[PDB]
């Protein structure tokens, strides 16, 4: 959800496997459908 | 890493796309049109034989007959070496 | 000179024949020293067969017509009591190496 | 000469492989790129030429 | 006119559009091109087995339709 | 020193592969390698083992192991190509053991271990195969004396 | 008449397509549903789908409502025939309940196989009797009044199958020495069908075994001039060998 | 990515108790949930 | 006859396996790797003044994911080599520094990036 | 009939979708249900995940919430088949307990391998019997009435395999000395499929020694005309070569 999907254009809950509706947010799990290389550039944070 | 893109694979994919467009242009215009929609080659969505029977206006019998004729024509060994190695 | 061989019971040159005191590669080395003459343009297959204890020599080979061994005293292998050696030597006519 | 070096066949094939496939398709020894790669991996004499 | 004669010689025997008898007779001997028949002299096709005068007349009318002639004719 | 076999040596190179039951399923050693010509698999046995004494080259097949499943996201172009040619119904990936580049030799010995037999194996794996390839390297350019 | 079992449903496709029930014909009706029934009958019990049946029977151009037409044809067949014979399977239709020997096609294949086995075993009389009883199952022209390209294809297939059955019966009758009817039937076949030259080769064998020589050479000249005029290719080496064996008076053939 | 038509996207505004307002897209065919997290502070 | 043989010392690369943590090609004879282009190599190419050869050895032929595939395509198709991008290892450097609470931002002449 | 043991559960994919439980039928059900059971049958007993089966039934656009649909299809299979013949692992579905001869496809590969082994050994009678048993396996069109482009893929694959199997059958029939049923089958198949070059080469080979030359080259000319009209190219060089050696009439291959 935070860093990005591990496959290409897939989401965590197993739905939205198709490439056509890219750039949308899944309702079940919130994972943006996009490339797997975005996990090389997306960071989060820890609140202390 | 298995997720790393292989340049040979991408070159093979784009050449497969170009050669598929070329062999589609090789066939007749109407046959190219009907095959472009059966597997939805033109767009991201394939279409059924009843779905294309309204815009073009033919029976299920005739549309599946010309479809199977296109598959048989592409199944001929002449138009195979351009695609057999492409798997 | 001999350019190809075949031994019954042997699938590659790195194994050993059951019943000879040295391995197959040493037999390859001994075959290379065997000098022959052949007037046939086509490859000619000789035959080598020896059974029982003894010492197989180049004279024990069986050459066809138009092929003869010229150094029959050359040692090839040594057979014990359980030695099986059937060998089809091919000779070809050529020059150089 | 002063400006020459001698590469082996395998080295020059693996270094210049994409150029070899491009020229093979240009010289139509193979029908397409995949067949050119197949010949290069197989290593026929036309590839060396 | 070099391109025209090259195209005429390069056409196969299927474009002749004539009877099966003469086509089978010429393909039996191994002839598969119009220029191959052109290079043949009169005695080359007058010695063909089961090749009557009707086949020769039909072939002559055919080539006359395409406008060319035989060798030394 | 080349024609008299003076300076030459036997070089036996060992490299193995094993079959394991992963999450998708267990890979098997077999004969029916997908999407390959029959001539490539001409020197295999029934259980997927290269014959003892089979001459091998770079890129050749030694033992035929098929990956039980890979992720299937077929493009419409590949879908219609599969419809044209017809593809085998089990979806398998060609991850069988092949000879590395620039290596030649004779298969001089094969060793097969099975989980179903009494032989011990590491956890997870089911079949383990070892293939020895031997070449008689002669002296040539670049050898160090 | 000895196999006329009570309650057995029999069908015939070697001639006009008809339905027989206990020796009584059934109202087949339209020739088009007859074509559909023959399409299901010619498979020797093998099933089919509706789509392939329509594509094979109705050519490239079916009308806009072919599915309702084939459905009502099959429904009419369901009234006229037994309900259990015609069954629905995955949207397709098939003929079931066919007993052994009821269909003329399956009986013809079985008798041909039995004749081949008897010929391999040396029983020539049993083989010729079996394939003469099988040849009596043909009711003239195959598929009378049956339209469609499929009808033409199986018409040609059954015609050449009958012709080759007659050819093998003819050659083993020549081997049996009964040339009197064989010569007349060979002449009738050559007059009817000038295309299958194995029949003329059997005619050469019959003429050589009969005794006359000059007429055989006249027939050879006629065959040669026809294969020169309409074909023009050289004669087969087997035909030339047979001709030179006839000319050399080989006592082995006589 | 050539010739592919993206799905239509609608803008739905989410507001938290701390007053943070952010815009993120939803698919037209996808159901709109009234519950979501905050991009700034993670509040409801 | 030494064991530093020539039949195994030969090794060449066109496009093979790549490292995971950074997108440079990996190394090793059995793994179809690429020869390391060390620091003194870069010093020598600076000394020649050959900016383009050094720049492409550092960007085109390694660690540019949008560059290597495009260059392979351009070579096979026969067209000219495309312009290089940014090596992925520098982006790894930026992401590493940005996580040590160092506000590392790249700004161009007009503005930020 | 000799392999009908007690407790045997026979499955069939070469013909339509059916189940034989010691001689009595089982209702395989919906066309999508038939496709699901066939897709489990083609995989010789994998645990295949739910998404893969969903793709196999439908392809690119399966309805969104139809995972429970495939669940209730699995329930249908479990209540119409044995409780233990179908077992689920990690959400995947798997049919086990399939003995030898239970699947006609496994028997088909077994018969093909046995025929290949007999051809390698040079035997003719046993290989002919094996392929005679193999040609009795298919019943009509394969995978009758099942949706899914996956099903189309194994349909065309099994059809092509059947084409090469009949090519081998006709080839050994020609080489062993069978011509009449050979030319009958070749004519029937070229009537069914007009654009196969290999079967027309087989036509030329069969008619070349059975005593038929004019219609063979007529069919060849028709093939050339259709191939020029639909493809506009030249046929394979092996064909022209086969027609060439035919023309000089070599008796070597007699
Ligand atoms: Zn999701």
Author numbering:
A (entry chain D): 50 to 97
B (entry chain F): 424 to 510
C (entry chain A): 50 to 146
D (entry chain D): 437 to 485
E (entry chain K): 239 to 311
F (entry chain C): 727 to 871
G (entry chain J), J (entry chain I): 17 to 270
H (entry chain G): 19 to 62
Show me the paper's own sentences about this structure.
Streptomyces antibiotic regulatory proteins (SARPs) are widely distributed activators of antibiotic biosynthesis. Streptomyces coelicolor AfsR is an SARP regulator with an additional nucleotide-binding oligomerization domain (NOD) and a tetratricopeptide repeat (TPR) domain. AfsR null mutants show defects in afsS transcription, as well as production deficiencies in actinorhodin and undecylprodigiosin. It is presumed that upon binding of AfsR to a 22-base pair (bp) binding box (afs box), RNA polymerase (RNAP) holoenzyme is recruited to the afsS promoter, allowing for transcriptional initiation. We find AfsR uses its SARP domain to engage the afs box and make extensive interactions with all RNAP subunits except ω subunit.
Notably, when assessing the transcription activation of full-length AfsR and ΔTPR, we observed that they exhibited lower levels compared to the isolated SARP domain, indicating that the NOD and TPR domains exert an inhibitory effect on the transcription activation of the SARP domain. Preincubating dephosphorylated AfsR with ATP or GTP significantly enhances its transcription activation. Besides, the activation of AfsR was likely triggered by ATP binding rather than ATP hydrolysis, as evidenced by the comparable effect of preincubation with a non-hydrolyzable ATP analogue, ATPγS. The MS results revealed phosphorylation at T337, the last residue of the Walker-A motif of the nucleotide-binding domain (NBD). We tried to find out the interplay between SARP and its C-terminal domains during transcription activation by assembling AfsR-TIC. AfsRT337A was used to eliminate the interference of E. coli endogenous kinases and ATPγS was used to active AfsR. The final cryo-EM map was refined into a nominal resolution of 3.63 Å. But the density extending from the C-terminal of SARP was very ambiguous and could not be improved by 3D classification and local refinement, presumably due to the high flexibility of the NOD and TPR domains relative to the SARP domain. The structures of SARP and RNAP in the AfsR-TIC resemble those in SARP-TIC, indicating that the SARP domain in the full-length AfsR and the isolated SARP activates transcription by similar mechanism.
